[PDB]
Amino acid sequence: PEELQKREEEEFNTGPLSVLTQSVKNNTQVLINCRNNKKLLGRVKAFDRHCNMVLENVKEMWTEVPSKPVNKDRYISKMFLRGDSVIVVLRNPLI
Amino acid sequence: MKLVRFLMKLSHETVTIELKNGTQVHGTITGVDVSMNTHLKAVKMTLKNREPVQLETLSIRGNNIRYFILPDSLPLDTLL
Amino acid sequence: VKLTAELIEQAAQYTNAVRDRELDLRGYKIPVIENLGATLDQFDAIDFSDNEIRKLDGFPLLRRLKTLLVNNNRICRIGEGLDQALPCLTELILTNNSLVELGDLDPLASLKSLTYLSILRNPVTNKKHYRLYVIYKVPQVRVLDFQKVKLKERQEAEKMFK
Amino acid sequence: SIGVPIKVLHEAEGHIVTCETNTGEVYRGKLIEAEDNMNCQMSNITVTYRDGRVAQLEQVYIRGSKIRFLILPDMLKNAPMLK
Amino acid sequence: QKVMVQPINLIFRYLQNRSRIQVWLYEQVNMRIEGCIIGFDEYMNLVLDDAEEIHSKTKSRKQLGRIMLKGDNITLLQSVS
Amino acid sequence: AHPPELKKFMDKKLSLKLNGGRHVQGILRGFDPFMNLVIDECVEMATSGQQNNIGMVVIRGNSIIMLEALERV
Amino acid sequence: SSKMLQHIDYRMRCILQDGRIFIGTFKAFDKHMNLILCDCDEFRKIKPKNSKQAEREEKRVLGLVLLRGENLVSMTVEGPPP
Amino acid sequence: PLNPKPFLNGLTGKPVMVKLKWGMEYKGYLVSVDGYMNMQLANTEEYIDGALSGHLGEVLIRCNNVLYIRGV
Amino acid sequence: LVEFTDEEGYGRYLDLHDCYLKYINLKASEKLDYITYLSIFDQLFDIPKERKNAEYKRYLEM
RNA sequence: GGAUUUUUGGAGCAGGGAGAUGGAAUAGGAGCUUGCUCCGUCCACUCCACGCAUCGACCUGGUAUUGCAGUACCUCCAGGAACGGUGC
């Protein structure tokens, strides 16, 4: 209801979800350390308690061994990463 | 607001899901539910180091799915 | 009576006594062998007993064939290219057919997983050195017609037919 | 509620099952006592652990978070679930 | 017919006597964190003191001390002293 | 919340297989409805033939793969 | 919608969580969707470890297997309703 | 006694070393751990094998991986 | 039946949605839509917006 | 109704060394085609720690049973290993 929805809003605002809070306020490009070691970069659109992150302008990178690892990197326009695969949520990246 | 209705508000739109079993499935998924329960319909799925297998009725699991890819011309504000 | 897809769709496909996924044709009398692909690879055994099948050929592309039952047949000759359509087919129940010639099983060598066969009550079984040509030209088969292949008979089958 | 596959495993209780756990462990034996938490205390089982040497032991107890699969008696094809 | 040997009772006994113990891991027999548990909680997550994670293979230990092991990775604690 | 049917396995000598390939033989005395156990004289043998007894251990149901009871209890 | 009930009673090849397969006529379902496969076939991979030997997929007889939700990942529909 | 929820109450603000389940570590100030106990760490140095390789600074470290979070 | 697309209609529409997705996965830019895709892919020998010296040539070949 | 027994996951990672052994009909970059030389993905044989031990069928001989039953797998010796996967 109203108080509980406000409580989830506060969990997004002044909790450990402040990363996604900035990601949805200033639209900071977010690093998404996936559990498969896949690095995702893009602007966020939506957030959840379970760390479900909606993303935009998404780039996906992964180091493939053909050796010498090659950093493959491609684009998915929009993205959606429900809170299962995401290991770490980095608000500000170096790029 | 969890992503339940953001995932469930979808039917038979050409999208690309990534199953956590290193595989991808693109197509018109039939219907999604609240706990990330989505089926596949006439979907083309590529596995880890494998072939472009075709599925006429495949039932994709929820936490075994690693990510989702929506259409490019869909307003995420109007979707989530 | 043409062999058709109704006599495929009304057939029984189950896990038979040998834990093999068999499609069965009870009372078919089909003298035309083709169009088994919609078997859908949920099957490994194909039984077509009580058939007027004049020739041993005309089968589609399946990867998991396990048993082929041509039991109670009327085969005259055998087609050759059974191997690319049966990669690892092993059991062939092919008795009661009009096999005579030593060249009636020349396409048999193309079977890579061939392990057992039964061609009894055929004019080809009664001949001398017949099991010799059998255990030679099917080198992979270790048992045929309810008796295993042996080192001595195999050496004799190598020596002969040279 | 209560799941009908779990009800079929209840109908397969007492009698022999052939289960496989997380470590490939194949336990083939009488699955006696079980719970809706898939925690099944069983007996008279040949537990192989997927290494090939199955040992015939008594009073095993296999959970279900490890459970890869479990073969339950075919005679339950007339169980009230499917019909 | 039987009574409780409760897990929270064992955890409280450890944290109250300052019982040092090595705590294993989930998915890995590799590391064990030997130390005295500073406290317990509802979901069996314990805080640590004087803990060092020592490997069975490497035979080396990295010090954590006041460690905070997650509750799902906990396998079993073996009382050292 | 359901408790297990562990009251028979109570006070029994049990050889259980825990994750990481571990083999622990011990005495069940009383458990928690989550199968959260405490094992008396619990001797957890390593991969090799070397084993050790550690007395009182609160073991995981996340790490315990299965368990066997060597008596009819 | 409990969608599965429309495709049940006919044969599907499901996956395991370790890359294998389970082909069978889906009998009944639960909340967690742990499956009940009747006369199931377990088509798994055999480790090749070589380029000079082929890659084969052998399937044993499971019968009625109650595959846990830790095995139900994705299940294509491949068989007619038996 | 130190229950872990008061442990995070006292260690929020201090230098947390967060070692994940893959061994991924971050040495930085931990900001908050909520009812989901997914931690938040800022001014983080990403330590692999105990040697910081990157500085991700502000980040939210999901709880599903962090093996331990200790005061360094 | 096996060679017709639904968006196609047996000769009314084309099979190019995957082509647009591949153009996106190649370009890595959000400033490319259906209008730019058509203005780039309609020309026979008009100026390339994407490289015929890179994997864009193989993508155009596909 | 993501904190130990089923779906917001503990997954992902790569295949032991080396020898003036070979191959890339169609695919490698450099020495600014060919001739020659180097290097970062396997297999085939040969060397070492045939990766080992375990066991389940399996191929060959010899070897016992004549035995009315609703089934994990059933006599035993020996091997050479064509296989499954476990502990390092």
From Swiss-Prot, chain A:
Coiled coil, from the record: none
Localization: Cytoplasm, Cytosol; Nucleus
Residue stretches making up the Sm domain: 17-95
Keyword RNA-binding on entry: no
Pfam families linked to this entry: LSM
CDD domains associated with the record: Sm_D2
Listed Basic and acidic residues bias regions: 1-9
One MF term in the entry's GO annotations: RNA binding
Record keywords: Acetylation, Cytoplasm, Isopeptide bond, mRNA processing, mRNA splicing, Nucleus, Phosphoprotein, Ribonucleoprotein, Spliceosome, Ubl conjugation
Record-linked PROSITE patterns: SM
SMART domains, per the entry: Sm (SM00651)
GO biological process, one term: spliceosomal snRNP assembly
Matching InterPro entries: LSM_dom_sf, Sm, Sm_D2, Sm_dom_euk/arc
An example Gene Ontology CC term for this record: U12-type spliceosomal complex
Keyword Cytoplasm: yes
Chain segments carrying region Disordered: 1-19
Origin: domain of life: Eukaryota
Recorded family membership: Belongs to the snRNP core protein family.
Quaternary structure annotation from Swiss-Prot or TrEMBL: Core component of the spliceosomal U1, U2, U4 and U5 small nuclear ribonucleoproteins (snRNPs), the building blocks of the spliceosome. Most spliceosomal snRNPs contain a common set of Sm proteins, SNRPB, SNRPD1, SNRPD2, SNRPD3, SNRPE, SNRPF and SNRPG that assemble in a heptameric protein ring on the Sm site of the small nuclear RNA to form the core snRNP. Component of the U1 snRNP. The U1 snRNP is composed of the U1 snRNA and the 7 core Sm proteins SNRPB, SNRPD1, SNRPD2, SNRPD3, SNRPE, SNRPF and SNRPG, and at least three U1 snRNP-specific proteins SNRNP70/U1-70K, SNRPA/U1-A and SNRPC/U1-C.
General remark: In the autoimmune disease systemic lupus erythematosus, antinuclear antibodies are developed with Sm specificity.
Protein name listed in UniProt: Small nuclear ribonucleoprotein Sm D2
Species whose genome carries this gene: Homo sapiens (Human)
Gene, per the UniProt record: SNRPD2
Curated annotation (Swiss-Prot), chain C:
Oligomeric and partner information: Identified in the spliceosome B complex. Identified in the spliceosome C complex. Found in a pre-mRNA splicing complex with SFRS4, SFRS5, SNRNP70, SNRPA1, SRRM1 and SRRM2. Found in a pre-mRNA exonic splicing enhancer (ESE) complex with SNRNP70, SNRPA1, SRRM1 and TRA2B. Contributes to the binding of stem loop IV of U2 snRNA with SNRPB2.
Biological classification of the source: Eukaryota, Metazoa, Chordata, Craniata, Vertebrata
Role of this protein: Involved in pre-mRNA splicing as component of the spliceosome. Associated with sn-RNP U2, where it contributes to the binding of stem loop IV of U2 snRNA.
GO biological process: mRNA splicing, via spliceosome; RNA splicing; spermatogenesis; U2-type prespliceosome assembly
GO cellular component, one term: nuclear speck
Outcome (variant: residue 67 to K): No change in spliceosome assembly
Protein name from the UniProt record: U2 small nuclear ribonucleoprotein A'
GO molecular function: RNA binding; U2 snRNA binding
Record keyword Disulfide bond present: no
Coverage span on the entire protein: 2 to 163 of 255
Keyword Ion transport attributed: no
Domain spans labelled LRRCT: 122-160
Keywords assigned by UniProt, alphabetized: Acetylation, Isopeptide bond, Leucine-rich repeat, mRNA processing, mRNA splicing, Nucleus, Phosphoprotein, Repeat, Ribonucleoprotein, RNA-binding, Spliceosome, Ubl conjugation
Mutation effect (residue 71 to K): No change in spliceosome assembly
Location relative to the cell: Nucleus
Chief localization: nucleus
Result of changing residue 72 to K: No change in spliceosome assembly
LRR repeats: 19-40, 42-63, 64-85, 88-109
Family: Belongs to the U2 small nuclear ribonucleoprotein A family.
Swiss-Prot record, chain E:
Tissue-specific expression: Widely expressed. In scalp skin, it is present in the hair follicle, the epidermis, and the dermis.
Localization per Swiss-Prot or TrEMBL: Cytoplasm, Cytosol; Nucleus
GO MF term set: RNA binding
Database matches in CDD domains: Sm_E (cd01718)
Pfam families: LSM
Coiled-coil portions: none
Biological process per Gene Ontology, one example term: spliceosomal complex assembly
UniProt cross-references to PROSITE patterns, sorted A to Z: SM (PS52002)
Entry-linked InterPro entries: LSM_dom_sf, Sm, Sm_dom_euk/arc, snRNP-E
Record-level GO cellular component terms: catalytic step 2 spliceosome; cytosol; methylosome; nucleoplasm; nucleus; pICln-Sm protein complex; precatalytic spliceosome; small nuclear ribonucleoprotein complex
Keywords of this entry: Cytoplasm, Disease variant, Hypotrichosis, mRNA processing, mRNA splicing, Nucleus, Ribonucleoprotein, RNA-binding, Spliceosome
Record-annotated Sm domain positions: 8-81
UniProt keyword S-adenosyl-L-methionine present: no
Family designation: Belongs to the snRNP Sm proteins family.
Disease: Hypotrichosis 11: A form of hypotrichosis, a condition characterized by the presence of less than the normal amount of hair and abnormal hair follicles and shafts, which are thin and atrophic. The extent of scalp and body hair involvement can be very variable, within as well as between families. HYPT11 is an autosomal dominant form characterized by scanty or absent eyebrows and a highly variable degree of alopecia since birth, ranging from slight thinning of scalp and axillary hair to complete loss of scalp and body hair. Pubic hair remains mainly unaffected.
Additional note from the record: Patients with systemic lupus erythematosus produce antibodies which interact with snRNP proteins.
Swiss-Prot record, chain F:
Matching SUPFAM superfamilies: Sm-like ribonucleoproteins
One of the Pfam families matching this protein, by short name: LSM
Ribonucleoprotein in keyword set: yes
Entry-linked CDD domains: Sm_G
PROSITE patterns registered for this protein in UniProt: SM
GO cellular component terms, A-Z: catalytic step 2 spliceosome; cytosol; methylosome; nucleoplasm; nucleus; P granule; precatalytic spliceosome; small nuclear ribonucleoprotein complex
Residues annotated as transmembrane: none
This protein's UniProt keywords: Cytoplasm, mRNA processing, mRNA splicing, Nucleus, Ribonucleoprotein, RNA-binding, Spliceosome
Location within or outside the cell: Cytoplasm, Cytosol; Nucleus
GO terms (BP aspect): 7-methylguanosine cap hypermethylation; mRNA splicing, via spliceosome; RNA splicing; spliceosomal complex assembly; spliceosomal snRNP assembly; U2-type prespliceosome assembly
Record domain Sm: where: 1-73
UniProt-listed InterPro entries: Lsm7/SmG-like, LSM_dom_sf, Sm, Sm_dom_euk/arc, Sm_G
GO MF, one annotated term: RNA binding
Subunit comment: Core component of the spliceosomal U1, U2, U4 and U5 small nuclear ribonucleoproteins (snRNPs), the building blocks of the spliceosome. Most spliceosomal snRNPs contain a common set of Sm proteins, SNRPB, SNRPD1, SNRPD2, SNRPD3, SNRPE, SNRPF and SNRPG that assemble in a heptameric protein ring on the Sm site of the small nuclear RNA to form the core snRNP. Component of the U1 snRNP. The U1 snRNP is composed of the U1 snRNA and the 7 core Sm proteins SNRPB, SNRPD1, SNRPD2, SNRPD3, SNRPE, SNRPF and SNRPG, and at least three U1 snRNP-specific proteins SNRNP70/U1-70K, SNRPA/U1-A and SNRPC/U1-C.
Family the entry assigns: Belongs to the snRNP Sm proteins family.
Name this protein carries in UniProt: Small nuclear ribonucleoprotein G
Originating species: Homo sapiens (Human)
